[PDB]
Symmetry: D2
Subunit: 353 residues, 4 copies
């Protein structure tokens, strides 16, 4: 059964529930919780497993809100945070001990597009009886079947919808039905009540209920509507990014094109094993910081902005926004949209001259 047909034909709060049922139908999951934002999904998954006196392990590649959750909020709830290089399975193994209640990471880092080996990391952590929680925003369900790679809990930010009145956001939390929850002292009391639903039960009836990141039915409705054309939009988006990365290799003025679909990518093999397509974000450089700025000022379709995964193609210089130390001032990050490929190539050519 295809993705688009599963978004369309699913086998109190009826709009939110209907969204949750779609998402479950789309992933084959044990169950799903829709929440008010991506940060709310992340923090709900963590706070379901971790409490004062525990630790958690995560990537040292976080910034902005996700970073601040781990640097400021979690230590205020008595949770020790261990930052590690998630590219290194041995550093991950050594950071984990009996206080460690989960490993959290992202499917593709931003802006470097590093791709951790999820299955390998799932095994390192499963051997110690620790669950794996992954933010799959860069590679949502049509691109990734996280259950096959050992991912216990999948979290993501939902399709955003921008209006005059502000941006409508959401989050999604997915239990893949992999981890034996009853083996954790955190969830054993909920196993008595809910059986295999122990994680989802605490997450929903306790953590979500008490911290209250409610999802509006109006947002839920828009997100369901988005799920209908997700496969179609992602196919377009991701084929455009794959073709752009390849074509960028032919442009004299362009250097250091980075996308995991390219054969010279360090993450070429792992991406091909994990993903239908390695997401719709790529990176590249011109000769200098100043050539990159002049290029960007000259684009007529692709716009400068902060968001990613818009229908519109968007670009920015991650350096100008502030480890920064490891990124080139001449690097630009391109979030590729659903425009016809010929127009995007044409805009980029034109902005070069």
């Amino acid at each position: 059964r295809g993705f688009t047909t599963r978004a369309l034909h699913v086998p109190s709060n009826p709009t939110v529930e209907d969204l949750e049922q779609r998402l479950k139908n789309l992933t084959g999951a044990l169950g799903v919780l829709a929440l008010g934002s991506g940060m709310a999904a992340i923090s709900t998954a963590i706070l379901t497993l971790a409490r004062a006196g525990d630790s958690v392990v995560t990537t040292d590649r976080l910034f902005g809100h996700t970073l601040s959750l781990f640097q400021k909020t979690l230590p205020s709830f008595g949770i020790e945070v261990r930052f590690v290089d998630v590219m290194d399975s041995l550093a991950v193994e050594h950071a984990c001990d009996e206080t460690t209640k989960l490993l959290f990471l992202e499917t593709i880092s931003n802006p470097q597009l590093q791709v951790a080996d999820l299955e390998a990391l799932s095994k390192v952590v499963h051997a110690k009886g620790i669950p794996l929680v992954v933010d799959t925003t860069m590679t949502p369900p049509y691109l990734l079947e996280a259950k096959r790679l050992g991912v216990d809990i999948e979290v993501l930010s939902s399709t955003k919808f921008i209006s005059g009145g502000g941006t409508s956001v959401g989050g999604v939390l997915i239990d893949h039905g992999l981890f034996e929850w009853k083996s954790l002292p955190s969830l054993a009391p909920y196993y008595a009540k809910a059986g295999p639903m122990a994680f989802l039960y605490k997450a929903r009836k306790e953590v979500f209920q008490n911290l209250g990141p409610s999802l509006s039915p109006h947002n839920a409705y828009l997100q369901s509507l988005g799920l209908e054309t997700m496969a179609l939009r992602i196919e377009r988006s991701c084929q455009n990014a794959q073709e752009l990365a390849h074509w960028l290799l032919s442009i004299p003025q362009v250097k250091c094109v980075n996308h995991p679909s390219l054969p010279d990518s360090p993450f070429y093999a792992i991406a091909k094993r994990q993903f239908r397509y390695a997401g719709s974000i790529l990176t590249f450089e011109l000769e200098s910081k100043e050539a990159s700025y002049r290029f960007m000022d000259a684009l007529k379709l692709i716009r400068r902005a902060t968001n990613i995964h818009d229908n519109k193609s968007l670009i920015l210089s991650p350096y100008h926004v502030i480890l920064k130390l490891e990124i080139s001032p001449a690097m630009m990050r391109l979030s590729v949209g659903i425009e016809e490929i010929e127009d995007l190539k044409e805009d980029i050519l034109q902005a070069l001259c």
Copy 2:
């Protein structure tokens, strides 16, 4: 300036507009709109309390707010002390140097107990502890919380029926936040705005209970008619509580506006009206069930503070019903109750 006037004449422009309206209505230092009532309560608490601290609250909580204090906060290493908030001495003895706030509601549910806010603010302020109050039962038109010493006001916003929910966090500009180790580090960056700065840029941003612009628009629309709806609703509830005293099959009417109510004086000092919820009993559980089955306007349901009048049996006496009084003309409410007897 009147309340209605101030609701009407004052990134995320709809949410910000809602926040400015609420700040105008309240005269507050500042205001944060959030995805729900629970988000507002938990955001206020987690701005002040962290692992190794304690908090004091009323022993009259149930449902979600109770589960936050029984399960979620002790998991964050926060010790919760439950006390009888009717007793200012027990409140005093529960607070020590670890205690980072007192939390309570303005009118308890379903008993309608009214704590003496100004008396409790003094007990807690005398130890350098802020007062955080859920004013859902008595929102801004009914209560000026800052006059009673309330540092942080929290409430559930007007719901719109899925159901669109919200919450509101209000800093009344009372507590000197730089004197607190929890906020002194923000004081450099935000001055008097240090509570709001932490709450918005750290706790809210990281736990993510985002308020939808669509909910925010509706709640703004709602604020315009708030004074008008609360007047009607609260005069109806006052009148009905009185009138109920005259009905031979009715016993034990409870509302703080009744002279014989234990909370008569405290409610009169604190509130324009003591909320739109009242309680009463018939002869017995069975007479109460028959009465409710026979109602044609007032409907049985769980929600409170709807435009529609709603009733339920909380079982506290098994014969007790709780009536959330709505904005229907008083004559039809009286008539439906009579007919159902």
Copy 3:
């Protein structure tokens, strides 16, 4: 049973239907049709009764869109329009002949606040077997029970809702169950199919369906929500206007205060007979056009604008906007809102000095 309780407890397109049922419950009508706008209600009522070769009679007090419908659109469908002074029952009687399929007017004219005698005019037209169609926007159902005054068809513009994205509008068409439709050759074929529902049947299944002024369920939902607080808002609004008109009489700088609730009003008796309150619009003058402008520039709550029946109090000089010949350049029209009366008095005092 009170108005507010009838808006709350009503005894395909479920949101639109629910609105229609509320409105019927609020008016005691035979039936109701909700439409995309006020102009759509007006034109639907007219085009249900009138066709090429017929005439219609209406007030000579129309302007803007309503006027343009009668001056340009209706004559293009072969309908003769006869404009008359509706203050004059004898001019009305003489304008009507066997080709005349309805009399259309408004409950209170704008900006002059003239109040035609509806019951008298209903009798003039009923005697000739002609129905009466009335726009009751100035005096909607809580203020007026149009059936008691002989009004066959009540039409109105719905409560508007302004957002970033533009204004959401609607219209309402009400059959009061008064006229015997089967006596008209226009509606007799529909009487065969629908009985007493003949008017509503043609209006809905034909005129509305074929010209297509559809009402959005999103607008319908907002309008239903508005109906809940209509009585409360109108009571406030209308008491404010009544008290303002009275109080304005005490202000040295103020002249020619016009509102039908004032005893010296020419429409004092007819308004008291017809309305709970004579609407929330009043008019007054200062000494000169220039004193009026300086007053208006100095108001701090009451704002200059074109709309009326907002929650906010709004004012304008009808002269500056362009018969104009019969209106004073120093006259201002005040649409009174729901602000506390003390603030409105205070703003007006302040803007005078």
Copy 4:
């Protein structure tokens, strides 16, 4: 520039934005968004025709569009002449000096008859009569109507399920409007914009089929994925019509993309794809009913052009079903049809 690019990169700002998108997608002189498809058709007609005029349209209308031409327009003193639009001679003989437009659809329903637009535009232009076409079956991504001589394009917008509806009126910048007595008086004020000026400031303003900003926002969102959804939908329908030819229990498949279709050549000349609706029969009415009862994905319903695939029996053969093909993966559509046989 591609279609998707143009949907994305272009008082009442949401409606105006929708209109600018549609103008970008079409290269038109201008565009009016309206409250429905019927509002768009009636607005185009009533801009051109008045009492004492005639109009010509196809004899293949039913439901609302048919009732407008049978009941509403003759009541406005407009004579309506119904003709076989497949026959350019009958079209010519129906037009005289009173005739102010020819109206038809791009693909008739349920027969799927495809009129030769460019041939009919010539017949009608040779008499100074504009061509007004409802392109609902073949919207802008599928058809560039201006190339085929179509003066005014009208269509129902993408619906969102109550149900939010819309319509669109498009002036392709082809007809010289000053040569017409109906519009010459606007030409002074509006120049080339005289059709649009009358339609918007007079007919639309006075009959009031206002488009909600909320519907308008959704339809804008919809336009962004229009090319993608129509590709999928129309390739599915092409493929299914072919594949249906191979199924022993299927007879009489109808789709203009089939070589044996009478409209094969005309559809290929006019359309990227000939719409997403096809027709077929089983052995008998009863076999057709059993088949439809047994479908698990494709649902019986009245709507067309949904994301979901929909089917019904229009009874034209009683055994005929009409399938509105949606955007499901082709394998699952094939599989549901097989399983149901």
